[PDB]
Symmetry: D2
Subunit: 94 residues, 4 copies
């Protein structure tokens, strides 16, 4: 099945994202074949640099909500307490 | 720029989605070249039929929030009052 | 019935909130008897000033989703295009 | 400080809410003095019974996001994997 996974950073915590970014990408690397689409949400203006990042969005294949839960819970970003909001939805291409 | 557009149906309103579905798809057709990814969110279980639809998710190119606003406001689904929640975020591929 | 109405400002749009604030409060004044709880969401840090505002949250009595829709649509804040996200839920005290 | 804590149940999981409800209320009891407003979100129709519950909303006093995090993480509902979405915002009365 496919799941949307939307996660928005807490205010004032951009540096937490930056501090944990390499670990986050290392965490995702062996999982890449299950990720269909993925990237940061961005804030004000038109910039697309690290400083513009405000959250994380992914569309991922998983066999169960349990698998999705483990993926989210084991993320360096989650363990770092980066996020103020997390939204998960089952989903399919139109 | 790219925008995530997440919209979740009001409870008890699946039939409103069904009633307006053809009009919604007609609305999207001439806009298809700007839509990167799109499809319905799905509810309980593993079904992927019309009866399983619970909302709409799209990633779309637009030049401004104003363009995104017009796209959302002119949607048959929006005019039908289908949605309980609407979330829009600027976004980029990782 | 009671409804939660959660609305989060677009990035970079604090001044839009400030510009429309008096009009927003004027809009709410004759409706105050239907509002149980209400106030701005706040951003980073501990400040509680105008500059700290990031969104609007209200719990309101209404007879229908239609009434809620009209309340939201007629708000100066909505007409100003202040919000990136809007979430509405029916709700009751525990 | 005050925080909005909004949590929406996964689809098909009403019985998980029911199974863990007594434990959840037992968890909240010694914390009641910090909870300003609280109750379930409700689904379709006008019913206000257990079967109508779809999520949890609270406004709570806490000294830090860390305290909010612990409150959320230790909830029987969280440990049961009840929720598809969790949104936390700092907030004040208007």
């Amino acid at each position: 099945m496919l799941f949307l996974i939307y996660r928005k950073d807490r205010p004032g915590s951009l540096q937490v994202r930056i501090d944990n970014y390499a670990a986050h990408l290392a965490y995702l690397e062996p999982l890449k074949a299950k990720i269909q689409v993925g990237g940061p949400t961005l804030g004000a203006g038109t910039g697309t640099d690290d400083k513009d990042m405000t959250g994380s969005f992914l569309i991922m294949e998983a066999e169960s909500w349990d698998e999705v839960h483990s993926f989210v819970e084991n993320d360096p970003f989650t363990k770092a307490g980066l996020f103020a909001a997390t939204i998960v939805e089952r989903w399919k291409h139109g």
